[PDB]
């Protein structure tokens, strides 16, 4: 299992950023893709997830209306787009894999694989 993310980006306030994550080594549609943000000197914050088979999503209240997640199964890649950027959105953004909610042994409760993060400066 590998997760490869795009390189660092620099944006101005009011702009939008899109971060990609390419997956390999597993059945892409068998897992949820989550995004987690880590601001400098801070801990980890969960943003939301997308399910590639259905294109269904769920977002943390913090980002509702600001963040959109999409995916493209033909290239096993997930995307996260955050609009109305502010200086406090400066962070390293990670993609992470977790099981779907129908997993019998609760594999959805944790993240078993992480990609290297993408640094976004605003």
């Amino acid at each position: 299992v590998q997760l490869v993310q795009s390189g660092a980006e620099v944006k101005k306030p009011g702009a939008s950023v899109k971060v990609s994550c390419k997956a390999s080594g597993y059945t892409f549609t068998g897992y949820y893709m989550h995004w987690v943000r880590q601001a400098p000197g801070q801990g980890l914050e969960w943003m939301g997830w997308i399910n590639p088979i259905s294109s269904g999503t769920s977002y943390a209240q913090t980002f509702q209306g600001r963040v959109t997640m999409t995916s493209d199964t033909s290239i096993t890649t997930a995307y996260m787009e955050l609009s109305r950027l502010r200086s406090d959105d400066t962070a390293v953004y990670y993609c992470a894999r977790a099981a779907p909610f129908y997993d019998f042994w609760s594999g959805y409760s944790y993240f078993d694989y992480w990609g290297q993060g993408t640094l976004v400066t605003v």
């Binding site: 990670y94 042994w105 409760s109 944790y110 078993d112 990609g115 993060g117």
Partner: peptide, 10 residues
Amino acid sequence: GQAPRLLIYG
């Protein structure tokens, strides 16, 4: 300088 990794679950 690295992403988090899982150690323990459940």
